[PDB]
Amino acid sequence: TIPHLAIDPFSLDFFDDPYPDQQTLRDAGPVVYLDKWNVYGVARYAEVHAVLNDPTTFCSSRGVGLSDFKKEKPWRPPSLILEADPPAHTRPRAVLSKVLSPATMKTIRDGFAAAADAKVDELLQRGCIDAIADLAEAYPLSVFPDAMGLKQEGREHLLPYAGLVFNAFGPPNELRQTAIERSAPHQAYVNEQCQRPNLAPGGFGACIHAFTDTGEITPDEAPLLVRSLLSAGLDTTVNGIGAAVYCLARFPGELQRLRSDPTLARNAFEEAVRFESPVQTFFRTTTREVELGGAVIGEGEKVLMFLGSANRDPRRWSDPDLYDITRKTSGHVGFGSGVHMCVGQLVARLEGEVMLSALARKVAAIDIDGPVKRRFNNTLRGLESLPVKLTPA
Numbered sequence: 001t002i003p004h005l006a007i008d009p010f011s012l013d014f015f016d017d018p019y020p021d022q023q024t025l026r027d028a029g030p031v032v033y034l035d036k037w038n039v040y041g042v043a044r045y046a047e048v049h050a051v052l053n054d055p056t057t058f059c060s061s062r063g064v065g066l067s068d069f070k071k072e073k074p075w076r077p078p079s080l081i082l083e084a085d086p087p088a089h090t091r092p093r094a095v096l097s098k099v100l101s102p103a104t105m106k107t108i109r110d111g112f113a114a115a116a117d118a119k120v121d122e123l124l125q126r127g128c129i130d131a132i133a134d135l136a137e138a139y140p141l142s143v144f145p146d147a148m149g150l151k152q153e154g155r156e157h158l159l160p161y162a163g164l165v166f167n168a169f170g171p172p173n174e175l176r177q178t179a180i181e182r183s184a185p186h187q188a189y190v191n192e193q194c195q196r197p198n199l200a201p202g203g204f205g206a207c208i209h210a211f212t213d214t215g216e217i218t219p220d221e222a223p224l225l226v227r228s229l230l231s232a233g234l235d236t237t238v239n240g241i242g243a244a245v246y247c248l249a250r251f252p253g254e255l256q257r258l259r260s261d262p263t264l265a266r267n268a269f270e271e272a273v274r275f276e277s278p279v280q281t282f283f284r285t286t287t288r289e290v291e292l293g294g295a296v297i298g299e300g301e302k303v304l305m306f307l308g309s310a311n312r313d314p315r316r317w318s319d320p321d322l323y324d325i326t327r328k329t330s331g332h333v334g335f336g337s338g339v340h341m342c343v344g345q346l347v348a349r350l351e352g353e354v355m356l357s358a359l360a361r362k363v364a365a366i367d368i369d370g371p372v373k374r375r376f377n378n379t380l381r382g383l384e385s386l387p388v389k390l391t392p393a
């Protein structure tokens with residue numbers, strides 16, 4: 001009754017062009033079984049949304065990667081937020097919510113915007129740049145480590161650590177094995193920066209540690225919560241901004257609309273998140289037998305959610321394969337949905353908005369002018385290199 005498919009959603013061929021296989025996954029049925037990894041899969045919007053919004057049945061504390069923490073040791077101590085269920089999830093989540101709050105955004109917005117404008121001005125002096133290394137990576141590197149309160153030395157470990165975290169949600173394929181083999185120096189740096197004396201006053205890290213006296217978290221929970229921001233807070237935005245620039249480079253008509261109304265910047269970024277879905281997948285584990293989309297799934301089963309596929313499901317979206325900066329994007333699952341929905345989404349949206357605003361005001365054209373190279377990761381979708389020529393307005 002449940003169709004069995006041999007598609008490997010973690011293979012390099014799939015990463016290179018996931019869209020045909022994602023349609024096959026959606027059209028085979030609401031629930032599929034992936035024989036390659038012995039997991040259930042849901043690729044339509046309806047079932048992805050339903051799974052995300054039932055955390056009791058589809059839990060996170062047994063891991064949101066392939067590995068079931070009831071069967072295997074986690075590769076690092078579990079995240080106190082991503083890999084926790086309510087009620088243990090609730091108070092750490094509230095702390096991160098307040099650390100990454102509107103008031104925090106108000107304190108950092110002017111500096112984030114100035115850094116975005118400065119980066120675009122700098123890139124316009126060069127003309128021909130790599131929109132990944134020189135923009136999607138360089139801009140978040142110029143604002144987020146400082147906003148965390150990190151020292152200068154050792155920041156080169158941040159992107160390798162995040163690549164490792166996101167590869168480690170995947171199955172035990174070569175991408176995951178190689179990441180773990182190389183992990184020790186990045187893990188050592190990241191864990192050390194999580195300690196209170198190593199986080200500069202006023203930054204996100206110090207603010208987490210300051211919350212350790214309200215009864216929401218204890219001092220021994222603060223380092224792992226800093227670790228969450230150092231895991232998820234940089235490489236996601238690199239791939240979100242890279243997605244937006246890649247969309248604007250491919251769809252010049254949308255760049256022209258954005259130039260004509262720079263207040264569309266925030267929605268242009270949100271649409272890029274839906275369109276590319278830089279965070280492609282997460283798993284849940286069933287805590288009981290459950291009926292989902294007419295199919296019966298037993299207890300203790302891994303369920304793979306295709307967030308990118310849900311964001312392109314024609315059952316939910318009109319013209320899902322078109323990039324449309326005025327689309328009503330509310331309800332997309334690129335940041336998740338429900339109790340675990342991205343706690344950092346205000347930081348991500350701030351960065352994406354101010355960068356797209358800078359481009360909207362300063363750049364007349366974005367033309368791909370070199371070979372495009374894709375980056376392969378078990379969870380992240382994005383480019384390694386995006387050579388573009390920027391023409392000034």
Ligand code: HEM
Pocket residue numbers: 060064081082083093096100228229232233234236237239240241273277278279282307333334335336337339340341342343344345347348
């Ligand atoms: C475009 C950028 C980003 C995307 C696409 C993204 C995506 C996601 C998704 C899909 C989830 C849901 C996880 C789940 O349901 O299991 C999530 C959660 C999370 N994100 Fe984001 N994220 C982004 C940026 C950020 C930033 C900038 C931060 C921190 C500064 C951050 C920190 C977190 C944390 C800590 C969680 C776990 C929340 C929880 O479990 O309650 N993310 N993110």
Ligand SMILES: COc1ccc(C(=O)O)cc1
Pocket residue numbers: 079080081082083165227228229231232279
């Ligand atoms: C969205 O991806 C992540 C990755 C890691 C963490 C974490 O370490 O808590 C949270 C979200």
Ligand SMILES: [Cl-]
Pocket residue numbers: 076187190
């Ligand atoms: Cl670690």
